[PDB]
Design a protein around this ligand. Structure first.
Ligand SMILES: CC(C)[C@H](CO)Nc1nc(Nc2ccc(C(=O)O)c(Cl)c2)c2ncn(C(C)C)c2n1
Length: 270
């Protein structure tokens, strides 16, 4: 493909971190004097074909609020996925460490608007994220937020996919039908978006504070939901609650969610 790059085109600068399936490095694409992010493959955590398929999916993604693929190094090991660099790291650490006078209520609305826009695009393009959380959103200059998209899957909007036998999910972000039946759809991303709103509203607090993850399912089925965070506008909390409807079909679409946040963002600025 025209996405293939020479390994020598990039010079690594610094290791940013990395966890589950690979490390992230800050690098420089010398030919364009451009700072980039390089995703490596951690052997024994993820198979080569599963990693190459992630890159194939990213090739098709083009949105201002979705991390842009720049190139890939597949020919031989180690394999790399080269994307644009997001200067301030993940949204979780950013919210926890920020100056709340600078990152005010309007900036929070701005951030939710950008995320919902990326999700509306995935919904329109027949993609599912399956890992929406603040730690998977990246921040750039002037509160620019982009959703990381390594784990995207092709799924016709409305269809439900089933995860593999004995799959582990981050319980507190996972929709009840996904916890109980390993069923994932755009509606399960709507549920996770609800949790992401709560992380934004609390400036990076951990959801279901103090609650045992093994008791979350039973609580959700008995209609327990996180309460309205301090300072959260009731309209924004009504949206979280609409995202947390037990029935997937009762949850709003990302087009409706995006429209609601766009209106509130325009109004708050005015
Ligand atoms: C923990 C690592 C892996 C990080 C945060 O989630 N991932 C991570 N961090 C990024 N950039 C930064 C920016 C600043 C810092 C800093 O502290 O100075 C750090 Cl750690 C990373 C990044 N940019 C594009 N990507 C794509 C690959 C989407 C990134 N993934």
């Amino acid at each position: 493909d025209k996405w293939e790059m020479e390994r020598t085109d990039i010079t690594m600068k610094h290791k940013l971190g990395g966890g589950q399936y690979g490390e992230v490095y800050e690098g420089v694409w010398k030919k364009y004097s451009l700072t980039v992010a390089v995703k490596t493959l951690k052997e024994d955590t993820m198979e080569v074909e599963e990693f190459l398929k992630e890159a194939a999916v990213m090739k098709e993604i083009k949105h201002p609020n979705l991390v842009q693929l720049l190139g890939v190094c597949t020919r031989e090991p180690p394999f790399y996925i080269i994307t644009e660099f997001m200067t301030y790291g993940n949204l979780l650490d950013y919210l926890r460490e920020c100056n709340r006078q600078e990152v005010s209520a309007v900036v929070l609305l701005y951030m939710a608007t950008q995320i919902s826009s990326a999700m509306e695009y995935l919904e329109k393009k027949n993609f599912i994220h399956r890992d929406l959380a603040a730690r998977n959103c990246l921040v750039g200059e002037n509160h620019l937020v982009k959703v990381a998209d390594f784990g995207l899957s092709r799924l016709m909007t409305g269809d439900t996919f089933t995860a593999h036998a004995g799959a582990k999910f981050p319980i507190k972000w996972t929709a009840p039908e996904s916890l109980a039946y390993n069923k994932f759809s755009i509606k399960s991303d709507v549920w996770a978006f609800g949790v992401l709103l709560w992380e934004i509203a609390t400036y990076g607090m951990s959801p279901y504070p103090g609650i045992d993850p093994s008791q979350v399912y039973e609580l959700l089925e008995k209609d327990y939901r996180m309460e309205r965070p301090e300072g959260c506008p009731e309209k924004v909390y009504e949206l979280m609650r609409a995202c947390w409807q037990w029935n997937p079909s009762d949850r709003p679409s990302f087009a409706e969610i995006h429209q609601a946040f766009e209106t509130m963002f325009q109004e708050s600025s005015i």
